[PDB]
Amino acid sequence: SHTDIRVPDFSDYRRAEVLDSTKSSKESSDARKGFSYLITATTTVGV
Amino acid sequence: SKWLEGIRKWYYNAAGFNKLGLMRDDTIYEDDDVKEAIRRLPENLYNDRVFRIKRALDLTMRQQILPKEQWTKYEEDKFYLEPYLKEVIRERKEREEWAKK
Amino acid sequence: WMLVADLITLTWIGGQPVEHPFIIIGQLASILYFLIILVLMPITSIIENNLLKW
Amino acid sequence: ATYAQALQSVPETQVSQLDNGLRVASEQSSQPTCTVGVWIDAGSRYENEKNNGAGYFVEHLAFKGTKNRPGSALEKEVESMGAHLNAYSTREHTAYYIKALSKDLPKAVELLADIVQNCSLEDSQIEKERDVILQELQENDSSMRDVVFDYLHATAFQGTPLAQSVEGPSENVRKLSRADLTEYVSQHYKAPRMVLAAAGGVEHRQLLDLAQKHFSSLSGTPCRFTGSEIRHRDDALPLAHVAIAVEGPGWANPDNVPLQVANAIIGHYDSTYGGGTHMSSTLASVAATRKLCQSFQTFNICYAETGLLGAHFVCDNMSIDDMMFFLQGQWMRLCTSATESEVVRGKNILRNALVSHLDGTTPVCEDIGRSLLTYGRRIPLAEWESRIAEVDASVVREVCSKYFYDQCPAVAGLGPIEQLPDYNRIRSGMFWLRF
Amino acid sequence: DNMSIDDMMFFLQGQWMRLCTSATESEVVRGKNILRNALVSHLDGTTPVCEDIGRSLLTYGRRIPLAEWESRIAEVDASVVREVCSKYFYDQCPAVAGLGPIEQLPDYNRIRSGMFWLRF
Amino acid sequence: RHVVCRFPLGPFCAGVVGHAALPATSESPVLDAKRSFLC
Amino acid sequence: MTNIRKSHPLMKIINNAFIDLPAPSNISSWWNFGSLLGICLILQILTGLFLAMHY
Amino acid sequence: LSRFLGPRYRELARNWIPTASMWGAVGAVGLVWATDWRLILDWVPYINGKF
C-alpha cells in the first residue's frame, strides 16, 4: 500500500525556478538560498 | 632505600587515613579513570572498600578515630586499585595516541 | 595555614600607612600569596604523591 | 606480489558489439562455473504512470513460459542442467542471469535469448502473476527498509519518473493487460539498450558467436531533486526507520569516489556489530555507547543524472533526535574538518569493498553489465585504485561541502517518528554557525 | 521495589494516622465483619480447632467462645478504634527492619516524624 | 565436501552483519525458500 | 495518590533542593557557612529595603 | 596540552584558521563600528564623512 501513495503536487507553492519537473535544482539552489539569505542578512543589518 | 622508606612511613602516619581504617587507594580522588577502575574491581574488594569508606565517614561524623590497634599498618596497606587504574590509564593513553595521529 | 596567615598579614598591612616597615612586609606577603597558590602548593602535592608511592 | 601487481594481473574485460547493437562483454577467469546474463536499460524510470508496474510484471512472467519452450519446459531444462536462473529489476536496470557450468554456456545463452525476445505472455499466466504481485505488494509493507526507501525516492524525486516505485501502484497492477506489457517489452527490450555479460570459464569468441547465433534477430529528461519530507507515523511499529538524503552525483560524475570515501568514513553500524565503543566511526561509537541506534547505514545510490546520498538508521522512539544530530554532525565535520588519517581509512575501506564485491562470478557479471549500461565501459580495478589514491582530505572536504553543506535534505520516516526533528531543524543542522 | 519504599511507607503511616485521628463508622463495620469471618473460618477443621484450644488455654487460660469474640467485636466502634489506634500508633517510636535494596527507606527520624500529624 | 555448507538448501545462513567483529552461524538446509512468493 | 511534596512542581523543586537532598553525613560545621551566607544575603536584602525607604 | 600535540591537531588547526581569522575580522569590524573608533574609521573612505 506504500506504493499507492504519491506525494501530492506542490506546484502552487513551488518557486518559479523549481516549478519544472524536467530541470535540475542544482543550478537554482544557489539563487534560491541567496534570495532567502539576502532577506535574512538585510534584516540583521537593520537590526 | 631505608631512608626513603622511613620518610614514606612518616608521611603515612602523618596522614590520617590509617587512623580511620582506610587504605591509601580508598582515599584517591574519583576521577573518570578511577571510576572505571572501581567499576572493574572484583566484588569482594569493592564491598571491602565500600565498608571501609562508610566506617571512615561515620567516624569523621562523630569526630572520632579508630582504636590504635585497628589502625592500618604501613606494611599491610595493599594497593588494590593501582593495577586496575594503571590498566585504565594505559587504555586512555593508547586512545589519545591514536587520536593524535 | 601559611596562606591564611599571609592573608591576615595583607589585611593588616593594607590598614597600616605606607612606610618603611610596612612596605617591605606587604611586598613579600603578596609574593608569598602568589607563590603559595601557584608554585609551592602543587610541588608539595607532587612530593606527597611520591611519598605515598602513588 | 604487491597489491598493485595483483590489480594489474586481473583479467581484462573484452567488449564487442553486434550489428543490432547488443554489446557482448566477458571476463575469462578459468573457473569450472560461469555466469551469463542480459542487462537491459529498462525500469521504472522509463515508465509513465499508466504503465508503472509493467517491468516488474514482465520480470514475473519472464521464466513462467516462452513460445519456444512453453510453460515449465524452460524451468525444467535449467534445473536439469543444474543452473540457477535469477532476475532483478530496478528503477534503472533489469537483469536476467543464469548461473551454470562453463560447458552449458550455449544452452544458457539460448535460454537467455528466448527469455529476452521470445517470451510468451499467456493471459492465464498474466492473471496468476497479477494475483502473486498483489499479494507481494501486501507483503512488502512488512519490509520497513524498502518502504522507507520508496518514500525517500517518492519525496526526493516527486513529480519525476524516478519517484515511481519498481513494483508500481496496485491499481496499475490490477489494470495492466497483455497488450501494454507486450508494448513495454517491445519499446524497452531493444538490442541497443541491452548488454550480454558473462564471467567465468567463458571465452569471448564463443560468447560472441553464440550471441550472433541467437541474439542477431533483434531490433537495430533529467530529474529534479526536491528537499521534502514524508512522515508516516505509526506508533504501533516497534522501531522507527528514518532515511535522509541529499542529491548526489550520477554514475558518470568523478565525485562519486570521494563521496564513497566520505561515506566509508561515516561508516555503518548494527546492534550485533562486535566493535561497539571502539569502532573507528565516531557516529558508530556514539550509537554503541549510548545505544542510540539499532542499525545505521550510509548509502550512495546513484542514477544516470542524479542520485541519493545520505544514511538510513533504525532507532527507538526516544533516540531519533540524537541520532539525527550525530549523523548531521558527522557530515558537517567531513565538510569542514576532515583529516588525512580518516581519509586513508576510508580509502582502504573503499578498496576492500570494491575488491570483495567483484569476487564471485555472479558479481563480476553484474558489474560488467551494469557498468556497460551506466558508464559505457568496465572500469578496471586499477583505474578505481588510481582515483581512490587521488582522493585526500582536501578533496573529501571540497566534495562534501559541494554536496552536503547548506543543501536541502530529503527525509523519510516510518514508525514512532514523533521525535524526528521538524524539517526546519533538520535543514538548520545541514549548516554550521561556527563555520 | 527499590524506588517505591518511601511512597509505601508514606501511605502506610498515613493510613495509621488516619485511623488514629479520623476513623469512620463504615470502615469500622467492614473491619469488624472481616475479623468475624477470619475468626470463624480459621476455626474450621480439627487441626485449627485443636490448635486454638491449646493456645487459648496456654495464653488466655481459657478458650474464648466465638460468641464472646462476636460480642467484643460488636462493642467496637469508630470511637474505640480511634482511641486504641491513638494509644498504640500515634507519636510512638516504631521498630523498623529492612532487607535488600533499602536505600530509599526513610531514615529513622523521618519514619518517626511520620508517626504524628502536624495537623492533629 | 565435508561441511554443512555442502548442503546448500540453506544452512540456516543466520549470520549477522558486522565489521571487525561479525559472528555467523550455520546449521543445514532450512527451507524457507520459494514460500516467500506467496505471503 | 501521590505525596504533594514529591509531585507538585514547586514543592518537587523545594523537596529535591532542601528536604530529600542526599547530603554527606560527615559534612562538618564548615559546611554551615554557605547557608549562613544565604541567610546573610536575605537579611541584607530586607534590612536594605527598609533602609532605602528612608534613604 | 599533551593530548593536543599530534599531526591530526595540526591539520585541525590549519582547517579552522581561515574560519577563526574571518571571525576575528568580524569582531574587529564590530568593535570599530560599535565604538565608532575614529582612528580606524578615518581610513575608510565613505565612513570618513562622519567626522
Added chain:
Amino acid sequence: QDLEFTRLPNGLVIASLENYAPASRIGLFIKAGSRYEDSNNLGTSHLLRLASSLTTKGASSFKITRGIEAVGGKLSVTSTRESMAYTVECLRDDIEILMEFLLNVTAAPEFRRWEVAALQSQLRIDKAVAFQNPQAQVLENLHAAAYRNALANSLYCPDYRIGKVTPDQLHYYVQNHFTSARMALIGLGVSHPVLKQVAERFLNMRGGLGLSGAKAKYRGGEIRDQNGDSLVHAALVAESAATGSAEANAFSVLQHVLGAGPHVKRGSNATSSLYQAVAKGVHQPFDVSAFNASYSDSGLFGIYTISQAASAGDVIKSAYDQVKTIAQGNLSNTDVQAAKNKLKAGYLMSVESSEGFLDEVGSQALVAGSYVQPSTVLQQIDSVADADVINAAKKFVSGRKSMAASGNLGHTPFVDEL
C-alpha cells in the same frame, strides 16, 4: 598456482593457495563448537564467537578493532555445531597485521571479567536476531530432539545461561578445545612459508588432541513449539550417515532428487519431486525441501515443510509419501542423473567464491586432514548408483523419526501418527 597442504609436527594443517588476487583471506578452522560442550558449560561457544574483538595479551580490544578498520579488513567468526572458524580478510599488503591480530585472538585470549560481562547482553540480541527466521528455532529444536548428546547442543546460548557464562569457562573451552591437532590454517592469497611462520610463532604452544566429546546418540524424539504463527514450520528427520561416507553422497543425491532449495526465482520447483507431490494434494501456499545435515559422527536426513496451519499435516504426509515412493523403487535413472548434475554444479558454485573455497578447504582439512580436488568429489558424486539412493530412502523410511514443528501446531501430525 596450486594448493599447498602441509601437516606440521604439532598436528596443525597449513594450506595456502596463491590466486594472485587483490584480496587475501586467511582463516583458522578449529574443531570446537556447540557439540564440544556439556550441560555445565552450555553457551560458551556462542560467547566465544562473540568475543573475537575482546582484549588479548598481544593487543587491546581498541587496538584490534581500530587497526582492523584502519587497514579496512574484516574479522569474522563462523560457528558450526562441530567447527568454529576465524577468518580475516584484507588487501594483500596488510594481511600480516590481521594475521597477527587473528593469532592473538585465537591463541592468547585474555577474558577480562568486565569485558566478558559486557558481552553477555550481546548473546540475547544475537539470538533474537537469529531466531527472527523461525527455521533457526525449528532446526535447533530438531537437533535437540534428534540427539541425546553432543550435536543436540544449540548454536546459541541457552536463555538460563545468557548472563552466567563465566570467563573461566571461556578459558577452559579455549585451552581444552583450541588445540593444534584440532586446528587448520587455510589462506588464500598468501605464501606457504609466511603462513608456516605465523603458525609457528603463535599456535605452537597449545598441545594437540584436546578434550574430545562423546559420540552423538540418536534420541529420536519430537519437540513441538506452539507460537501461534500462521505458517507451521516442521522438519521430519532420520539418522542418515556421517560426512565423507559413500552413504552420505547417496543421501545428498537423494536430497537433490526429492528437491533441494529452489533454482528459478518465483519458480514452481517443477523438477523437485516433493514440491509436485505436495502441490497435487495441497493447493494453498506451501514450501517443501529435503533436509540433509552431515556431521562427523552422524547425519540427519528428512523433509522440511513450511505450510499453512490447517494444511500442515497434508503437506508433511504428502512429502513423506513421495519419499516412500522413492524408497519402494520408483526412481528413474534420468532423475538420478539430473540430481547428480545439480549436486556437481552446486559444489562447483559453492567453491566459486573466495569464502566458499576457504570454508571448503578448512572443512576438508579438519574433517579428513587432506584436500580433495573438485574433480575427485565430482567423480565420487557420479559414483553413486540409483540403488544406493533407493536404499538411503529406505533407511529414512524405516528409521526412527525425530520431528520439530513450530507454529499453530493444531492439525500438525505427531511422529507416531506419521
